[PDB]
UniProtKB/Swiss-Prot annotation, chain A:
Cited function: Binds directly to 23S ribosomal RNA and is located at the A site of the peptidyltransferase center. It contacts the A and P site tRNAs. One of the last ribosomal proteins to be assembled in the 50S subunit. The simultaneous presence of uL16 and bL36 probably triggers ObgE's GTPase activity and eventual dissociation from the mature 50S ribosmal subunit. It has an essential role in subunit assembly.
Pfam families, per the entry: Ribosomal_L16
Gene name per UniProt: rplP
Family affiliation: Belongs to the universal ribosomal protein uL16 family.
Residues modified to N-methylmethionine: M1
Keywords per UniProt: Hydroxylation, Methylation, Ribonucleoprotein, Ribosomal protein, RNA-binding, rRNA-binding, tRNA-binding
CC per GO annotation: cytoplasm; cytosolic large ribosomal subunit
Identification of the protein by name: Large ribosomal subunit protein uL16
SUPFAM superfamilies in UniProt: Ribosomal protein L16p/L10e (SSF54686)
PROSITE patterns (UniProt xref): RIBOSOMAL_L16_1 (PS00586), RIBOSOMAL_L16_2 (PS00701)
(3R)-3-hydroxyarginine modified-residue sites: R81
MF-aspect GO terms: rRNA binding; structural constituent of ribosome; tRNA binding
Top-level taxon of origin: Bacteria
Modified how: Is hydroxylated on Arg-81 by RoxA. The modification is nearly suppressed when E.coli is grown in anoxia.
Protein's organism: Escherichia coli (strain K12)
From Swiss-Prot, chain B:
Protein name listed in UniProt: Large ribosomal subunit protein uL10
GO biological process: cytoplasmic translation; negative regulation of translation; translation
Family, similarity comment: Belongs to the universal ribosomal protein uL10 family.
Assembly description: Part of the ribosomal stalk of the 50S ribosomal subunit. The N-terminus interacts with L11 and the large rRNA to form the base of the stalk. The C-terminus forms an elongated spine to which 2 L12 dimers bind in a sequential fashion forming a pentameric L10(L12)(L12)2 complex. Two L12 dimers associate with a copy of L10 to form a very strong complex (called L8).
Residue numbers of the full-length protein present here: 1 to 131 of 165
Remarks, miscellaneous: Ribosomal protein L8 appears to be an aggregate of ribosomal proteins L7/L12 and L10.
Keyword Aminoacyl-tRNA synthetase among UniProt keywords: no
GO terms for MF: large ribosomal subunit rRNA binding; ribosome binding; structural constituent of ribosome
N6-acetyllysine carried by residues: K37, K105
Example of a GO cellular component annotation carried by this entry: cytosol
Superkingdom per UniProt: Bacteria
Swiss-Prot record, chain C:
Family in the record: Belongs to the RelA/SpoT family.
Changes seen on gene knockout: A slight increase in biofilm formation in a csrA-disrupted background; when combined with a spoT disruption (a ppGpp0 mutant) there is a very large increase in biofilm formation. The ppGpp0 mutant makes decreased levels of CsrA and its inhibitory small RNAs (sRNA) CsrB and CsrC. Deletion of relA alone decreases persister cell formation in a hipA7 mutant; the double relA/spoT deletion obviates persister cell formation.
Residues of the ACT domain: 69-143
Name the UniProt record assigns to this protein: GTP pyrophosphokinase
Domain of life assignment: Bacteria
Function of the protein: In eubacteria ppGpp (guanosine 3'-diphosphate 5'-diphosphate) is a mediator of the stringent response which coordinates a variety of cellular activities in response to changes in nutritional abundance. This enzyme catalyzes the formation of pppGpp which is then hydrolyzed to form ppGpp. The second messengers ppGpp and c-di-GMP together control biofilm formation in response to translational stress; ppGpp represses biofilm formation while c-di-GMP induces it.
Curated annotation (Swiss-Prot), chain E:
Keywords, sorted A to Z: Ribonucleoprotein, Ribosomal protein, RNA-binding, rRNA-binding
GO molecular function, one term: rRNA binding
Organism of origin: Escherichia coli (strain K12)
Name assigned to this protein: Large ribosomal subunit protein bL36A
A GO biological process held by the record: translation
Gene (name only): rpmJ
Length: 136, 131, 143, 94, 38, 141
RNA sequence: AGCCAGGAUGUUGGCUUAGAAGCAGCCAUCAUUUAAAGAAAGCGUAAUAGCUCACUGGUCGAGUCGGCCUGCGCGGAAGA
């Protein structure tokens, strides 16, 4: 579970997510798992996806995780009436805009990558799609 | 395998062999085996040597498309699991009778030996010739 | 014991940046005090030693071979390393020192264990029984 | 070798832009040198295929328009966020 | 036999088959591979 | 003239088929005759140089008249002989160790010529060089 | 796509293992006869053997195969 190392605050407004990805292009490896969906990846989801990905590809092949949570999610303690101040910071999430590159891979064959990313997508909530580094 | 390139090139090999070949022989393993082949083709290798090369491809649209130019008498060999074999290394060879004897001797058969024509011999061992 | 070029008995101290065993033979560096500094034959650190003073160095062998360090490497953890415990018993030489290094930069699970050997042969089978376990992606003498 | 047919655009702007991009054809532009920057509409499919070749982003392209076989070097392209399709291209006139 | 919402070929012999609309996976090899639904 | 029954090709000692794997139930599951096999094999291979695991093919007859078919001791063994190596490598072509001489192998490829595939000793010599690949050996002229 | 045959030899390759011979592990990933046969893709034996495959030839003889982009549906889908 990746977690922000001490933020400026402790709680953040719910906000929204009316947008598109910025890191749309694959940055490092010649492989990436672009997220087609529009969601909120929990640290758990990300770390788990990494595990499965990694497991599949053995220790060979470098991997990057383009996303990072940095969005504290508060929630009320089960069974408490609305109000009485904002809830406790249950966990952390990372907002995902359609077309957001998630994980990137390199040093391994396209086929294996395709499979690892398949498993990653499986673990992940939002729908994704396989991609390859673009030549400019 | 690729295409017309190798096909036509193997055909060049064909012309090569017929260019100075004598009584080319027909070849068609019915139920022979590779273990036998180890000393089989090796034996052709003991005959003339690099001579026998059973490039199976008696396809009427393939090797047969490559046939015409030399010893067109070869066509007759078109349908079913058959092939070709010449006699470039052998003007007036005894190479043909070798196939008869073996036709009934450990090889099941090889198109039952009939060949084509240079010393005027279809299904006929080239008997009347100095060894 | 160690036939330092035609004579044994000579006080020496084994190097601690390498693990010499009765194999490649050993280069012998003469320290100020503590007599001889066996550093195994052929080693980078050994290289700098020669670099500054070749004259005070002569070879050595084994005459008539114990204690060594090994770096086994495992997959993260969640328990199968406990599997390694089970192996602790099967290992003949008493483990001398546990030293896991799971740190580095990733989820790597290396362990610098220190033990001993009675004969190079026996060592062979050592690596064998280490290579068998799937979680033991790596197992080699640390230097 | 990357020869490409293309039409002159006559409706620059986001509206027609998307209106066109929906029509399996997308806007892109040729510019560079003292020559006047030129809005260029062009078929999506063909180029979608051409780009697969890395040379498409190195080899001098030969866009054709009204008989004008202008040669241009590939400069930049705005791919869609996720849908495997082009949205816009930047042909440095060469 | 399995009754998954996600049937898939399990071996070389596994074969997808749409009986009366219900999708199925009959398999000449291991009977266990037989599964329905999806 | 029998062809199929107990005809399998098995490496066996040129004149010492006594252990279990070389003889024992290795031909026992196939049911082969230790007895006469010894008598004749020994009786004739005593003239043959001993100690090298030459390949042999058991050929059974209808009333059990066996024909062991020895070829020529293993190229790997010939490599141990002429090269003077006692062992190849745990890492074939990753750590070549046994020193070799081309002509030695060529003449040894002539013995193997005596029994191989084709006609040219040299092509068979390449097979022996291929054997050297199989075990990880340094080549030397 | 079916149907015929063959699918090896050197040599059971080496380290290794009682045995690793195609098939415990690791390396090698060559040669040969080749139409084709990988020191082997699945199965199989204590290892073998053996079953099969890739591959190649025969016949038939017209397209067939694998992905992508989208329209519309199917399954997923049980409550008093």
């Amino acid at each position: 579970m990746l977690q922000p190392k001490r933020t400026k605050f402790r709680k953040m407004h719910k906000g929204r997510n009316r947008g598109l990805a910025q890191g749309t292009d694959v940055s490092f490896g010649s492989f990436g798992l672009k997220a087609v969906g529009r969601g909120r990846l929990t640290a758990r989801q990300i770390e788990a996806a990494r595990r499965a990905m990694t497991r599949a590809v053995k220790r060979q092949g470098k991997i990057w995780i383009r996303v990072f949570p940095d969005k504290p999610i508060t929630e009320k303690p089960l069974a408490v009436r609305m109000g009485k101040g904002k809830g406790n910071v249950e966990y952390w999430v990372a907002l995902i805009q359609p077309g957001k590159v998630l994980y990137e891979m390199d040093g391994v064959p396209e086929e294996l990558a395709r499979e690892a990313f398949k498993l990653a997508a499986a673990k992940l909530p939002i729908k994704t799609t396989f991609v390859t580094k673009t030549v400019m | 395998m690729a295409l017309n390139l190798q096909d036509k090139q193997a055909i060049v090999a064909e012309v090569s062999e017929v260019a100075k070949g004598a009584l080319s022989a027909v070849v068609a393993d019915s139920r022979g085996v590779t273990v036998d082949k180890m000393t089989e083709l090796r034996k052709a290798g003991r005959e003339a040597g690099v001579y026998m090369r059973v490039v199976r491809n008696t396809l009427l649209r393939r090797a047969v498309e490559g046939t015409p130019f030399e010893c067109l008498k070869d066509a007759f060999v078109g349908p079913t699991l058959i092939a070709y074999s010449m006699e470039h290394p052998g003007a007036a060879a005894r190479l043909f009778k070798e196939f008869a004897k073996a036709n009934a001797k450990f090889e099941v058969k090889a198109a039952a030996f009939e060949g084509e024509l240079i010393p005027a011999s279809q299904i006929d061992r080239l008997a009347t010739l100095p060894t | 014991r160690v036939v330092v070029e035609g004579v044994g008995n000579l006080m020496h101290h084994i190097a601690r940046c390498c693990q010499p065993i009765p194999g490649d033979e050993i280069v012998g560096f003469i320290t100020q005090g503590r007599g001889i500094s066996v550093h195994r034959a052929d080693c980078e650190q050994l290289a700098e030693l020669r670099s500054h003073a070749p004259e005070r160095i002569v070879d050595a062998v084994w005459g008539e071979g114990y204690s060594l360090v090994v770096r086994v490497v495992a997959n993260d953890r969640s328990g199968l390393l406990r599997d390694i415990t089970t192996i602790l018993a099967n290992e003949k030489v008493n483990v001398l020192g546990v030293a896991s290094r799971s740190d580095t930069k990733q989820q790597l699970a290396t362990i610098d264990m220190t033990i001993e050997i009675y004969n190079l042969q026996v060592l062979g089978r050592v690596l064998g029984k280490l290579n068998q376990v799937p979680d033991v992606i790596d197992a080699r003498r640390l230097h | 070798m990357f020869t490409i047919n293309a039409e002159v655009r006559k409706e620059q702007g986001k509206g027609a832009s998307r209106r066109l991009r929906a029509a399996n054809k997308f806007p892109a532009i040729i510019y560079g040198g003292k020559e006047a920057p030129l809005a260029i509409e062009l078929d999506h499919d063909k180029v979608m295929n051409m780009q697969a070749k890395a040379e498409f982003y190195s080899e001098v392209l030969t866009i054709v328009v009204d008989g004008k076989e202008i040669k241009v070097k590939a400069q930049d392209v705005q791919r869609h966020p996720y849908k495997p399709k082009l949205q816009h291209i930047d042909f440095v006139r060469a | 036999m399995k009754v998954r919402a996600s049937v898939k070929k399990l071996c070389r012999n596994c074969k997808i088959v749409k009986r009366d609309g219900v999708i199925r996976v009959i398999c000449s090899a291991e009977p266990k591979h037989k599964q329905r639904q999806g | 003239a029998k062809k199929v029954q107990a005809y399998v090709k098995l490496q066996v000692a040129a004149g010492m088929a006594n252990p279990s794997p070389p003889v024992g139930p290795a031909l026992g599951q196939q049911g082969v005759n230790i007895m006469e096999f010894c008598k004749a094999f020994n009786a004739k291979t005593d003239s043959i140089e001993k100690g090298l695991p030459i390949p042999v093919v058991i050929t059974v007859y209808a009333d059990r008249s066996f024909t062991f078919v020895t070829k020529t001791p293993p190229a790997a063994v010939l490599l141990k002989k002429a090269a003077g190596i006692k062992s190849g490598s745990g890492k074939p072509n990753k750590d070549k160790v046994g020193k070799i001489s081309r002509a030695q192998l060529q003449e040894i490829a002539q013995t193997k010529a005596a029994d191989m595939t084709g006609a040219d000793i040299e092509a068979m010599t390449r097979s022996i060089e291929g054997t050297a690949r199989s075990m990880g050996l340094v080549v030397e002229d």
